Design a protein around this ligand. Sequence first.
Ligand code: HEM
Length: 446
Amino acid sequence: PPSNTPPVKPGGLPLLGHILEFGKNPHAFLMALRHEFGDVAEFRMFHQRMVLLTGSQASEAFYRAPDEVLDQGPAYRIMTPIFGRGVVFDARIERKNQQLQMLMPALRDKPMRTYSEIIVAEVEAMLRDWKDAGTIDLLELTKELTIYTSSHCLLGAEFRHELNTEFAGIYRDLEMGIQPIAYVFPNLPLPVFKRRDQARVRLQELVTQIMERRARSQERSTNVFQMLIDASYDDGSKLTPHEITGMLIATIFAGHHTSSGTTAWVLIELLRRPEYLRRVRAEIDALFETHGRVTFESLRQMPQLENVIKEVLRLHPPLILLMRKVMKDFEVQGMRIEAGKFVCAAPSVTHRIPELFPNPELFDPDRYTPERAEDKDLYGWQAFGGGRHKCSGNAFAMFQIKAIVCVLLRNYEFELAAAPESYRDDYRKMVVEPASPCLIRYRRRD
Ligand code: HEM
């Protein structure tokens, strides 16, 4: 009497499974898998057996599982050298959870007003460097803008001014260390891998220096770094500069390409839909004539723009595979998923289920008005994941993007360099953004 298990896609290659076809187009693949096998569908990545949970029901099973059924550890094994050993997600389930819990208040509530001012200020700042008119690569602009605003808010002014050029190069070497051989996490050593390892060492050095310099000086700035210094375990014991360095890098990687890509898409989508450029522009111009400046209070209630960002995240979730190891038999929609196996959510797929998002392929922000399609189901729309391990900085992300767009749109008029339909997702990236050659034209407003 064997229990009903989920269907397995007729395999491809012996030691490769489906990996090449999947790798060709991860999204197209997962769409195809679901379309042919339904809510719960097994495929093989190398040796390993992945199970795609799509739809409201199967998504709930995923996001609500205890940390003791589904472990996010292996998904991050490529990151461990960058984050440090035993720092966060390499740490024991209970220790990992305290570190994450220390971040949450750093990225919500009280510091949010300060972050707003810093982010607004940082964009206003760089915008003074701009010619009257010109052509820029939109993706590069939002990646620069995001790393500046992030690092200022998360690390502090030290890393924007005094440690600017030093940090810039560390982050590069850190970023460059994200190579899928390390993602297997099988062998750590290589030329680029040491330049990665050297980078983390030098950052932990820079951190401790600033810890010590901010302590003998009675500087008290508002940043995640400062709050991680002031945080403490339930022990009463404190974070070591190893941990503080690990958590700050995790936060920056978690927030950088995700935000930068989304800001790009919010501008692209607004620039190929004049209808919505007007609704957003009218909202901003209204915001200024009611506040005379971009202000934490003003950013809070931008319904037009919130709705646009929400639809952009429906059509363009930057993270499209959320992977977990099954370390306990749990059951999804009747089908039993064996321990030792892998499960994963696919925001990009579930977001196009017609039963959840009527006319899924149509861009319509008005889905997210009081007669909504994001509220009355919590495991439909899932761009920020869900459950115990949902994004800590969804609030930060929303303000970051609302601020950048507000300022850019208020000072500058934009128009696409190439044909509107030519702007496509590049699903072959670890974090999905628009295609690399993503040019745009600016000219000072009025
Ligand atoms: C802007 C668009 C963003 C999107 C779409 C996004 C999406 C996500 C998703 C889907 C996860 C869960 C991954 C998983 O379940 O394995 C996640 C986790 C996380 N995100 Fe984001 N994120 C964004 C921005 C940010 C920003 C700006 C920050 C911080 C500044 C941030 C910090 C985090 C952290 C710390 C986690 C780990 C939460 C945990 O596992 O407990 N994210 N994000």
